[PDB]
Subunit: 101 residues, 2 copies
Amino acid sequence: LSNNPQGLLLEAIHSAGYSGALAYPLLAPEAALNRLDGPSLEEFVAENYTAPRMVLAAAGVEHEELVSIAEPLLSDLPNVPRPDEPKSVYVGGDFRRHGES
Amino acid sequence: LSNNPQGLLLEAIHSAGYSGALAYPLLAPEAALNRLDGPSLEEFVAENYTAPRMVLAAAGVEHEELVSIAEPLLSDLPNVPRPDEPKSVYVGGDFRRHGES
């Protein structure tokens, strides 16, 4: 990872200067990587990948064709109440990490 | 070295609070470890191991025989005067190092 300090510093700024939601890291630290698992992914997907939060966007496709091929594949998903988005406050200070010379 | 967090914290206090002579690390960081050489050590010793900085202490040794044995082996060193004491100034400081634990 250290080969690109820009991405590392963006992640560091987000983690430092946000508290919960935006502070959740994006590159999966080693402890999280060890803890992660297939059933955990299954549960996460099944809980979050729901119909009221899915957009299928085409760039060079006729709309009639796209909808006629996509409705028999997505119309039977369960209708969920779209649970609310997380909160995050900005107050945040300094992150400092020492590496190469 | 990470298995002894107490010594690490003490060294971190010294490094992050002092500035200069007392902030110089005691445990040879990676780059300096790579760079050190036999001639470097030899020059350091030759410049810093002078007579006004030699104390031969003995615990249960008679003074007469001790001096009779240690006079020929030490009286011929050059009389280099003491250099100026390495001055350091104390400031505040915050050190913070994430890790697995």
